[PDB]
Paper text:
We determined a 3.1 Å crystal structure of the SF12 Fab and a 3.3 Å cryo-EM structure of a natively glycosylated clade B B41 SOSIP.664 trimer in complex with the SF12 Fab and a Fab from the V3/glycan patch bNAb 10-1074. Although 10-1074 Fab normally binds with a 3:1 Fab:Env trimer stoichiometry (Gristick et al., 2016), EM class averages showed either three or two SF12 Fabs bound to the Env trimer and only one 10-1074 Fab. Like VRC-PG05, for which a crystal structure was solved in complex with a monomeric gp120 core (Zhou et al., 2018), the SF12-trimer complex reveals recognition of an epitope focused on the N262gp120, N295gp120, and N448gp120 glycans on the silent face of Env, rationalizing our binding and in vitro neutralization results. We conclude that SF12 binds a VRC-PG05-related epitope with a different angle of approach and an altered mode of recognition from VRC-PG05. Consistent with differing binding angles and CDR loop conformations, SF12’s footprint on Env differed from that of VRC-PG05, such that interactions with both N-linked glycan and peptide components mapped almost exclusively to the SF12 heavy chain. SF12 interactions with the N448gp120 glycan were mediated mainly by CDRH3, with additional contacts observed with the light chain CDRL1 and CDRL3 loops. Unlike VRC-PG05, SF12 directly engaged the protein component of the epitope, forming extensive hydrogen bonds with surrounding residues. Interestingly, glycan heterogeneity was observed at the N295gp120 glycan, which correlated with the presence or absence of the 10-1074 Fab. Indeed, superposition of gp120 coordinates from cryo-EM structures that included coordinates for the N295gp120 and N332gp120 glycans showed that SF12 binding induced conformational changes that resulted in the N332gp12i0 glycan occluding the underlying protein portion of the V3-glycan patch epitope. Taken together, this explains why a 10-1074 Fab could be accommodated on one protomer in our trimer complex, because the N295gp120 glycan appeared to be under-processed in the 10-1074-bound protomer (GlcNAc2 versus GlcNAc2Man6 observed in the other protomers).
The HIV-1 envelope glycoprotein (Env) is the only potential target for NAbs on the surface of the virus (Burton and Hangartner, 2016, Kwong and Mascola, 2018, Wibmer et al., 2015). Env is a trimeric spike composed of gp120/gp41 heterodimers that has evolved a plethora of immune escape mechanisms to evade antibody recognition. We identified SF12 and related bNAbs with up to 62% neutralization breadth from an HIV-infected donor. SF12 recognized a glycan-dominated epitope on Env’s silent face and was potent against clade AE viruses, which are poorly covered by V3-glycan bNAbs.
Numbering used by the authors:
A (entry chain L): 8 to 66, 66A, 66B, 66C, 67 to 95, 95A, 95B, 95C, ...
B (entry chain K): 1 to 82, 82A, 82B, 82C, 83 to 100, 100A, 100B, 100C, ...
C (entry chain E): 48 to 138, 152 to 185, 187 to 309, 312 to 321, 321A, 322 to 358, 360 to 400, 404 to 454
D (entry chain F): 152 to 185, 187 to 191
Amino acid sequence: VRPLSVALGETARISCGRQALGSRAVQWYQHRPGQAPILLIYNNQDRPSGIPERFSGTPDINFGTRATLTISGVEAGDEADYYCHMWDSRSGFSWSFGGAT
Amino acid sequence: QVQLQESGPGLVKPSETLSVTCSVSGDSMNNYYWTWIRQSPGKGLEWIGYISDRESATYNPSLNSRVVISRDTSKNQLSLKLNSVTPADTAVYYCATARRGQRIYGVVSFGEFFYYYSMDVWGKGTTVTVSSA
Amino acid sequence: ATTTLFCASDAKAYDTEVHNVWATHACVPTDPNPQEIVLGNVTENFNMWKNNMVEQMHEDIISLWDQSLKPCVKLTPLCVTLNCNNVNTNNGEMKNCSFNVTTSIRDKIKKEYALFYKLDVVPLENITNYRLINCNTSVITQACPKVSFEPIPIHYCAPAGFAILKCNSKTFNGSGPCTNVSTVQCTHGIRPVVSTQLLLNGSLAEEEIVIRSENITDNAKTIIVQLNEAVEINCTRPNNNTRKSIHIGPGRAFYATGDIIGNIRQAHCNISKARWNETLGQIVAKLEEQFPNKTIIFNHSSGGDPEIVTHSFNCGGEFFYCNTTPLFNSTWNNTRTDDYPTGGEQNITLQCRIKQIINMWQGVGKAMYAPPIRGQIRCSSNITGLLL
Amino acid sequence: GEMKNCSFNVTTSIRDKIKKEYALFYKLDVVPLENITNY
Ligand SMILES: *[C@@H]1O[C@H](CO)[C@@H](O[C@@H]2O[C@H](CO)[C@@H](O[C@@H]3O[C@H](CO[C@H]4O[C@H](CO)[C@@H](O)[C@H](O[C@H]5O[C@H](CO)[C@@H](O)[C@H](O)[C@@H]5O)[C@@H]4O)[C@@H](O)[C@H](O[C@H]4O[C@H](CO)[C@@H](O)[C@H](O)[C@@H]4O[C@H]4O[C@H](CO)[C@@H](O)[C@H](O)[C@@H]4O)[C@@H]3O)[C@H](O)[C@H]2NC(C)=O)[C@H](O)[C@H]1NC(C)=O
Ligand SMILES: *[C@@H]1O[C@H](CO)[C@@H](O[C@@H]2O[C@H](CO)[C@@H](O[C@@H]3O[C@H](CO[C@H]4O[C@H](CO)[C@@H](O)[C@H](O)[C@@H]4O)[C@@H](O)[C@H](O[C@H]4O[C@H](CO)[C@@H](O)[C@H](O)[C@@H]4O[C@H]4O[C@H](CO)[C@@H](O)[C@H](O)[C@@H]4O)[C@@H]3O)[C@H](O)[C@H]2NC(C)=O)[C@H](O)[C@H]1NC(C)=O
Ligand SMILES: *[C@@H]1O[C@H](CO)[C@@H](O[C@@H]2O[C@H](CO)[C@@H](O[C@@H]3O[C@H](CO)[C@@H](O)[C@H](O)[C@@H]3O)[C@H](O)[C@H]2NC(C)=O)[C@H](O)[C@H]1NC(C)=O
Ligand SMILES: *[C@@H]1O[C@H](CO)[C@@H](O[C@@H]2O[C@H](CO)[C@@H](O[C@@H]3O[C@H](CO)[C@@H](O)[C@H](O)[C@@H]3O)[C@H](O)[C@H]2NC(C)=O)[C@H](O)[C@H]1NC(C)=O
Ligand SMILES: *[C@@H]1O[C@H](CO)[C@@H](O[C@@H]2O[C@H](CO)[C@@H](O[C@@H]3O[C@H](CO)[C@@H](O)[C@H](O)[C@@H]3O)[C@H](O)[C@H]2NC(C)=O)[C@H](O)[C@H]1NC(C)=O
Ligand SMILES: *[C@@H]1O[C@H](CO)[C@@H](O[C@@H]2O[C@H](CO)[C@@H](O)[C@H](O)[C@H]2NC(C)=O)[C@H](O)[C@H]1NC(C)=O
Ligand SMILES: *[C@@H]1O[C@H](CO)[C@@H](O[C@@H]2O[C@H](CO)[C@@H](O)[C@H](O)[C@H]2NC(C)=O)[C@H](O)[C@H]1NC(C)=O
Ligand SMILES: *[C@@H]1O[C@H](CO)[C@@H](O[C@@H]2O[C@H](CO)[C@@H](O)[C@H](O)[C@H]2NC(C)=O)[C@H](O)[C@H]1NC(C)=O
Ligand SMILES: *[C@@H]1O[C@H](CO)[C@@H](O[C@@H]2O[C@H](CO)[C@@H](O)[C@H](O)[C@H]2NC(C)=O)[C@H](O)[C@H]1NC(C)=O
Ligand SMILES: *[C@@H]1O[C@H](CO)[C@@H](O[C@@H]2O[C@H](CO)[C@@H](O)[C@H](O)[C@H]2NC(C)=O)[C@H](O)[C@H]1NC(C)=O
Ligand SMILES: *[C@@H]1O[C@H](CO)[C@@H](O)[C@H](O)[C@H]1NC(C)=O
Ligand SMILES: *[C@@H]1O[C@H](CO)[C@@H](O)[C@H](O)[C@H]1NC(C)=O
Ligand SMILES: *[C@@H]1O[C@H](CO)[C@@H](O)[C@H](O)[C@H]1NC(C)=O
Ligand SMILES: *[C@@H]1O[C@H](CO)[C@@H](O)[C@H](O)[C@H]1NC(C)=O
Ligand SMILES: *[C@@H]1O[C@H](CO)[C@@H](O)[C@H](O)[C@H]1NC(C)=O
Ligand SMILES: *[C@@H]1O[C@H](CO)[C@@H](O)[C@H](O)[C@H]1NC(C)=O
Ligand SMILES: *[C@@H]1O[C@H](CO)[C@@H](O)[C@H](O)[C@H]1NC(C)=O
Ligand SMILES: *[C@@H]1O[C@H](CO)[C@@H](O)[C@H](O)[C@H]1NC(C)=O
Ligand SMILES: *[C@@H]1O[C@H](CO)[C@@H](O)[C@H](O)[C@H]1NC(C)=O
């Protein structure tokens, strides 16, 4: 994993796994240490209730490029472990939640 | 308001039948899609499959179809059945809900779409160890 | 009489020195002020079904296609044994074939990879193992790139001492007399569009739709329907596919398909529903006079080859083969029906399919391999009549 | 004899397989090449 723990007020970027190879629909998750994994982003941009606008994602120009979560203005409640569930119409199935971080 | 409550054996013997029940508090089970998520320590989460309104289920081929998800709609509880367990199945378990999501990319009538699932309401956590001791 | 006729094509083209297929370098530039002498009380009779210009034009078009692809690559070292798999999609129409080929130096060997379509392969006899579609009955020739297929118009001119007569009647069938005859030396701007089942970039009739046949009671005579307002069709092929370049022998390159970048989609065409409903409704009012007692139905075609029973045309480099089963459904008694549900959606779609190897004009020893076009494809044709 | 029954390997229409064929043809169409008569 790559550790990115800068003093607060900067912008963090975390990249996901496999190269793209078709149109995607990628989730994101927040597994706090000692806690349960919490959903953050579905459909590459969409944000449920209770999450601030500091999180964004990657569009569907995908076609060989990596998926990325972006955290602008990192705060104190932003240190956890983030996973990455994968979907695309071209590469088959998925049964794991991507490489850990 | 809905709450999930894992309740299993805690410690069993290998090569036997196991059962873990997630008690649901807040809604009847006929409106939601249900799933279990296991976590081996250090590695990533794993999704065993799902269960639906019309008993739609597709179990993981890497789980090798040794699982049958059972349900208790009377006590509003989500159970689980799994036979001939291995010591590699030692994992922190979770019970969770699932929602419908459909992605379109071409003309629909040719079948150029697919389905994906998000998990929003999570459980609280339990640990079942498959060990000889 | 009967004579030879020569080409005429004007200089809105002829700025680049390129050779397409319908030569246009040897075509004389046509006259800017074409003289049309309107004759007097002159009644000549015309016969659409005994006309020599049609056989001249058929021989000409076959000979023009035979001029090009004479100095082109022969694909005789390509009829070899092909392996295959399917394309790595989820869990098909294009195959990922591999084959041994001799290199440019006839002492070594080389292993290659190419993607191309089903309808261009035949199974040979577990590992699936086959060969190409037409390499036991025909010698096959790759058409060159930088050689255009675009149908630019052709005027037919008669030599000195001859003349061409012309029918100016509004409603004129085949095989009758006229009472309004003009004379020219140079015909209409006729476009060589090669297509089945429908007539695309044509010429429209005036104030009615007109139905022609030789003997309409005889059912072995084809029927030509000419409309008076066009019905637009809008085809495409949405796949961003590359092209390889395999070199076979000295100075001869072979152009295959490489990978596919993106999604895998089919090749729809989107004809409009209400407009074509109007068209098909006003065809049958003229049809109900030649058979004035009965219901008439439109049924689809009959099985067979894909290049006979389907609408086949040329869309900027590829050859499309859409089938017209969503068109020809219905059943009409009193110029009304219930076979369209008056709801749901507009835009009747059609399913095309792509084919490289083509032996149009039903050849028995010759074929053609159209190399792939890089990018995406659109046509927007302009339907003017049809063949029943 | 004035006829000859001849057999020969041929490379067929598909340029990987080897076929074996028979044909009768006349003397005065042959030349002896060099026991089996092999011309
Ligand atoms: C022959 O006729 C047929 C029909 O008979 C035509 O077929 C059509 O083909 C197009 C593609 O060429 C299909 O479009 C696809 O439709 C998807 C669903 O559309 C609706 O999606 C949601 C509802 O779930 C709405 O929000 C949309 O409405 C909004 O967008 C449109 C855009 O024009 C506006 O007009 C509306 O006013 C709304 O603003 C639609 O109603 C659609 O989701 C999809 O687009 C996504 O995917 C492509 C793939 O690259 C992306 O480029 C695009 O940006 C979209 O991506 C979304 O999601 C990602 C991440 O998830 C984000 O990054 C994006 O910002 C975006 O949110 C695509 O457009 C259409 O469905 C299909 N018709 C039918 C009936 O199936 C043929 O084209 C026609 N052929 C010819 C030659 O004429
Ligand atoms: C890559 O390609 C594979 C192809 O192998 C593809 O797998 C297919 O996945 C889909 C998605 O799950 C499967 O389709 C669904 O199957 C379920 C369950 O049926 C299967 O399982 C039972 C045993 O559990 C078997 O007895 C049965 O024979 C099947 O094998 C169905 O319940 C699904 O129906 C829903 O979808 C329909 C399409 O829209 C709806 O019309 C239908 O009503 C259902 O939708 C919901 O509608 C309402 C919404 O709320 C609700 O009221 C309803 O109750 C219902 O919940 C559907 O048939 C399919 O079987 C798989 N293919 C095969 C061959 O098994 C992958 O998905 C694909 N992956 C990618 C990324 O493209
Ligand atoms: C292109 O030409 C090559 C020439 O080498 C072909 O390779 C062939 O590959 C097979 C499979 O490895 C070889 O078969 C071998 O058979 C022995 C005998 O049982 C076995 O012990 C080996 O493990 C192996 O299976 C074969 O010798 C080899 N060569 C030839 C001349 O056949 C290749 O198949 C050709 N490809 C195409 C598409 O034609
Ligand atoms: C004649 O060709 C037409 C196509 O123009 C065919 O009509 C199609 O019929 C199917 C089934 O009847 C329709 O599918 C269904 O439509 C309803 C109405 O919205 C919808 O609720 C369903 O979910 C489903 O989509 C289809 O829409 C319709 N196509 C069009 C363009 O209207 C017809 O089947 C052909 N044959 C005959 C005998 O009419
Ligand atoms: C056409 O090609 C075939 C290819 O098999 C030729 O067959 C050859 O036939 C001879 C005679 O049977 C084979 O000779 C063998 O020799 C060993 C050692 O003496 C002996 O033990 C065997 O019983 C057999 O006689 C030979 O292996 C075989 N194959 C090849 C590659 O030569 C055939 O002769 C050809 N015909 C013509 C007209 O060229
Ligand atoms: C085209 O229309 C003309 C009418 O001007 C038809 O010519 C007449 O046809 C009838 C019936 O066959 C004959 O009895 C007449 O002798 C024809 N000539 C004239 C001057 O009336 C002609 O048959 C039509 N052709 C087709 C193919 O329908
Ligand atoms: C068609 O099949 C060939 C099989 O060799 C594929 O070529 C290899 O693809 C892998 C996968 O990325 C590469 O690592 C290799 O470098 C490729 N070449 C060789 C010689 O092994 C090819 O990618 C396939 N094409 C499609 C579209 O599926
Ligand atoms: C359109 O034509 C097909 C055949 O060209 C007809 O299909 C036949 O349908 C009958 C219905 O009872 C079957 O018994 C036959 O076996 C079918 N095939 C053949 C070859 O006759 C079809 O009925 C026609 N449609 C309409 C509306 O007339
Ligand atoms: C032409 O397209 C039509 C589309 O309606 C095809 O008709 C149906 O194709 C499906 C495909 O599986 C079959 O299950 C049906 O039996 C077909 N008929 C009907 C009435 O729905 C048709 O097959 C296409 N023609 C060819 C030669 O492929
Ligand atoms: C020429 O020689 C060949 C030797 O193979 C003869 O062909 C065989 O003849 C026998 C006897 O009739 C048949 O049973 C076989 O089926 C034939 N073919 C093969 C491949 O063995 C052929 O008949 C001879 N011709 C003459 C005129 O003598
Ligand atoms: C054609 O017929 C009309 C009427 O009979 C006659 O007056 C005229 O002179 C004729 N010729 C021309 C060239 O109009
Ligand atoms: C070529 O092969 C195909 C299929 O094997 C067959 O239909 C065709 O008749 C063959 N041609 C000849 C001349 O044998
Ligand atoms: C004959 O056709 C010409 C074509 O332009 C037209 O000008 C002329 O009026 C027509 N004559 C009659 C009598 O209809
Ligand atoms: C047209 O076809 C009918 C039907 O076969 C035949 O009787 C007739 O002789 C044909 N010719 C004419 C001029 O009607
Ligand atoms: C098609 O693929 C090529 C590959 O580099 C790319 O340059 C081009 O932009 C693509 N076109 C579209 C429309 O995506
Ligand atoms: C068709 O023939 C019948 C007699 O069989 C007749 O009564 C009817 O009027 C005819 N149809 C029309 C449209 O005239
Ligand atoms: C003929 O038309 C009538 C009314 O116009 C309709 O009821 C009937 O279904 C049609 N077809 C037949 C075969 O009578
Ligand atoms: C097609 O035209 C007929 C006659 O005008 C009409 O009854 C029918 O509703 C039309 N269908 C559609 C889909 O517009
Ligand atoms: C599709 O239908 C619309 C009407 O909803 C029409 O305006 C459009 O021209 C059609 N598309 C074509 C004919 O390509």
